[PDB]
RNA sequence: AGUAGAAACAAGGGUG
RNA sequence: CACCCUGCU
């Protein structure tokens, strides 16, 4: 009786058993080396998708340009890049007609937050590409380096302390001709002219997608320069402001909101009286989305959205797509040859890849190289149309929801009226009609006006089905939503933060899955026990009665040998776990306080221990767990001696950039001293214009004189402090 | 004069006044009469701040010094010229101290005479118009505003104060001097775009316009005048979304590839392992591992000098002989150390690959080499289907004669909901305990923890590790199981996906000739013999590898047990919600409910609930055991067709767009893994057995 | 006041002089987090790799004079290895466990007041109410609901100014209190937080958590009492209800 | 050899 | 060569 688990679906619906189709208890694939072939593949794909566009140039730079503007319209089912100007204009003029005041409300609100915002906020965010060091640097580092290299040469506005003037200065940057750059060779100096400067500031680098499941081949992801994240933040606030308040949008969105939103969008149409009109839903995914959207379209869209505002705002916002149109993408890393079957191995220059034939490397990659040749100008390719994944997230959804909106009974001028939801990667298109030909015609007009705007349904993935059971964004709906405890198995486990910062996240995740996604109580007990065991193994904290041998055996043996009631002993000190569902919402120390020994508490809770490290308040009882992109998770647990911080990577040392580490030591020492004066600098980035020691010496004089008026201190300290102030001032 | 401020006044005055000044559109010369007034305000304030100092005896005495020599303090508390946040720092420090109210607009001074606070102001406005405008500014509080004026005017709270006059005389002299000696010059956000970047913007226009200004002027006057109607009238009729149907008959199969067969890729054996048993009260993590291996190996009679039975087509197979030949040697070494390295015998060197790495020589010096070419960059060779997997599944589902998963209890329960859930999990764990998939996950976690630990500790030492597992029995006593041995290799692992190369030796009783295809890499090396009947006992020996990610995921494998229960108890939820009673007992015990869980020549054969539970364990186990980048592609492209078939099966009128393309996608994932190939065969057979 | 002498010590050097003399207050923000390292974009992997090494965690310097370099058995408890990018010290987990039997003792009975929000929960749960279990379909509606068991209902910034006034009193600027209720609260709070050795940001954070109101889009069935929204685990589930009311 | 796959693991820079 | 800095730079 050879078994087959797929025979299960002859009794249980394929949407009440979907959970048993995810191979998500395994490991995801990764990328074993360079990703430059992907880069030229995608670049060639764009330049061929927009072929009968126009070939053009630049007078300032030289990187070849290509216009995918309307030109010849399509002629068969083939992804193309000839969206229409008049289409994108009317498509949102109509949207405005649908709900008045959206665009002007957005203009007002974003105007306000734009004049209010500051440069320091940039400090948070993902990694970035530094144009002075030619490399992927974290956020604050690139920030500091660009400000510094700005001050080095002749600029005078950045000292404003704001943000908008920082962006202005970025703007002014592109008018000089002789920019000076500092290098960290173990600190030489180099000079870059106007051309190679403009070239240098527009380069977003490429990398290989990693650890993402649901696909066979790998992908490529691009990261943009910190020169332009500023303009990005303005256009992002604008678009998000437009789309926070659209029933058919899901970009400024949350979680269960999505489910309730589509639930009420199903109700009406599902409610459509069963009188004379049948209806289907099409589950549709858009293929090659960001390879047909363009900069000119976004720019004309902006020229329409912010009509009738101050010119300050309109210019500021329209600079982003212009800078976005003339962009260049780095080729990549190179290729690690064998060069023979004997012991030879090397690495070639990603530049000589443009200087070598590469006939040695497979003739398919030879085709890649030959086609990509005319697009390289300096270590980078000219990607005039298209855009690489991960740069915008909003405006595309606004176009999608607009062409959705085109389909009401108001302007289609016939019986067919289509609508639905659009969520960045999916469209659920519910069509309503009395006639089968009605549904045919509706789908045709939809796909037609879509190809008019450069969003092309994927016929290979999209399917029609009577309403009642459909799925989108891996949410599966069968006359209502159901639960799949499969996409949340990755998060189940020792989060990898600390000890106490994890004994809480585990139970917190079990909490959320027991409240929202249908994880019954038996399974709650189950995952609780599994988490306990995995924790105890990864942290070597087994029970006190256990004679399992580890590096932390004898100490914990001590701790156990002298305690009147060990039920007070913490989990990661050798204590019995007493969590349940009743106890599942209270961190552990708060739960077992009543049962501790006093001296224990004094040794475990005392703030005189050196293994606690508190940073800025933006990071306290928080953690960024691994998931979509990474979101910030919060937890709660009594701060104790277990909240350590594991080490860092000692790898800059055997390199030519170790001096950055010493610069960091010096900065940090300069900063801790300041912190010694105003503890309030944990709840406020203090604003001021000084030399950062004026604050110190000033408050020094003040506080001394104060304490001496009431408190008990002798005056020799008064005099000595005053002459040490004379000291600190006698030099410069 | 334009620079009359840097001309005659004091530099300190100039800087401390300008710093507070340059804060808005005001430039260094704007309406050049006012700066003089601002700086003169600062001068008179500062000069008032001189010539007064406190004695420890708290008097008020004029001190000619104008600078205290020592052991003193000045009678003022300057707040002008300071910093914004420091200003409030100071004033609030003054507040919470002995005596000070909360002032609401920027004051100037303070005095510890009787705990009071002064404000000052001098401009052209003569006496009370200024005095009364100041009142309007600050009246809501009681404060000691001692104002001065040009000629002689000064007033105090009820004209009640205590201070000397020679200072105010000095103030008179100051205002005397600063009549500019009759004033001999008689008196009294935009963000444009530059050139280069505006050019760059121009180059970004649709192909008829030539200036961004005209583009603004054109988008300004827009109103729908017929775009979609007319264009969709002019757009040729081939571009369309035709609708295609999906009828009763479930379509043609997904054609599997063709080639030579498929072999076992598991990093360890599955249904060809033995178990040497020792009675020992050792717990799960107890005992010296090497020592238990000793006590295990000792109780077997029939070892003989090994001879190669099944060569390894590509390799110097004699080495493997010597490899095993070394092991017993070292075993007699420890009659114990908790860890044992292994000498660098060359039989252990080739079989683990030292110096098999082309030296990263510089490229520019080696461009003359004849074979200078990039490597691989091609596709995996194809394969076929072989019929062992189904036997492996069938054996995996079976119930053993041994428990294998002892669980760490939790806190007691009082709530009845907790009692119910506990009584459910009792039965679940009773059924899901005795299963060969539990043996799998136990062995897997133990082997991969030992591997990552020892590979992190020693980074040039050929460690070896035995594989012992722990499992109790129905009788009550607990046994100890030995399965074989593992030998590790050098472990400089920088990237997340670097490889460690390790040799594995496993016991077995399966004569390999009966199925040589699945042993293309193993090397059966007959070691000893058993007695019952006499059956030869073999040792499958091989060289494989692992990475950091695979090791990590192998660390957490009991998570598969979470994908099982959640699907079994959701079968009890939807069915306990109806009968209005505690249903789960009648669903696990005396259960009649069945479920189609397979296919046989007699037809589809059903199973009780525990059959479903173990069957569900098995797939979760194999998704990790044989994890592969083809399995995910297959599952993700086949869930579509599975849902479409389901939607058809219950009258939802399903219609498609392109089935041939979806079939091409489902087929492009099937290359060589026994796993994805078995799953493709499964889905095809199910589509055949589920027409509608 | 040793602090100003330390300031001079840091000032005499050329590098720190040039830095401090040319670091405006605003730049301080930047300088707080200039770093050549990034974030661990696989938190569990690296953690498994760290727990097998010998010196994985990091501590301050007061260790040596507070915790012995040797052990009672001989296991190293800290090392001379200075850390990268910092001036801290590498330490093995073993130190922590010792500190838990041979460690400095202090007074933490004024401890539970800092963490009022938490202990409130357990003193509640102790006095719960028992009730039967019922199985039936359960109507669910996803709506917005609050989860804090009582608070001041004051704004985020409205409590931010409150906290800045109470905990760092010398540094609250020209802002003043307006309401009498909040005045009385700040009064009793300035009273309570006296004579308690405890982390500054930690206590201020506990109060910030106990003041501001917070709401979430949650699938509720029935009442929306915050004391109820605490116990959604055992109150109601997928297909059952359990009878219990918060203390 | 082995891992694996559209590229790379099978330790790399540093001093005599 | 003989030695030792690295294990996400």
Author numbering:
A (entry chain B): 1 to 186, 207 to 647, 650 to 754
B (entry chain A): 1 to 188, 203 to 349, 354 to 550, 557 to 716
C (entry chain C): 1 to 247
What do the authors of the reporting publication say about this deposited model?
Influenza virus ribonucleoprotein complexes (RNPs), composed of the polymerase complex (FluPol), nucleoprotein (NP), and RNA, are essential for replication and transcription. In the life cycle of the influenza virus, the viral genome RNA (vRNA) or the positive-sense complementary RNA (cRNA) segments are encapsidated by a virus-encoded nucleoprotein (NP), with their 5′ and 3′ termini clamped by the polymerase complex (FluPol; composed of PA, PB1, and PB2), thus forming the ribonucleoprotein complexes (RNPs). We report atomic-resolution cryo-EM structures of mini-vRNPs in two states: FluPol located inside (State-In) or at the outer rim (State-Out) of the NP–RNA ring. In State-In, interfaces for FluPol dimerization or Pol II interaction are blocked, but fully exposed in State-Out. These structures reveal detailed FluPol–NP–RNA coupling and suggest a conformational shift in RNPs during the viral life cycle.
The relative flexibility of the RNP components limits further improvement of the quality of the cryo-EM densities. Focused and masked refinements were required to attain the reconstructions of FluPol:NP-0:NP+1:NP+2:RNA unit, NP-0:RNA unit, and NP+1:NP+2:RNA unit (the positions for NP-0, NP+1, NP+2, NP+3, NP+4, NP-1, NP-2, and NP-3 are defined in Fig. 1) from State-In mini-vRNP at 2.97-Å, 4.75-Å, and 4.52-Å resolution, and the reconstructions of FluPol:NP-0:RNA unit and FluPol unit from State-Out mini-vRNP at 3.83-Å and 3.62-Å resolution. In contrast, the FluPol:NP-0:RNA unit in State-Out, as a rigid body, has a ~90° rotation compared to its position in State-In, thus resulting in FluPol attaching at the outer rim of the NP-RNA ring. In both states, the relative orientation of FluPol, NP-0, and RNA is conserved. The structures of FluPol in State-In and State-Out share high similarities with an r.m.s.d of 0.723 Å for all the visible Cɑ atoms. The interactions of the vRNA 5′ and 3′ termini with FluPol in the State-In and State-Out structures are generally similar to those observed in previous structures. The first ten nucleotides of the 5′ end of the vRNA (rA+1 to rA+10) form a compact stem-loop fold that is inserted into a deep pocket at the interface of the PB1 fingers and the PA CTD.
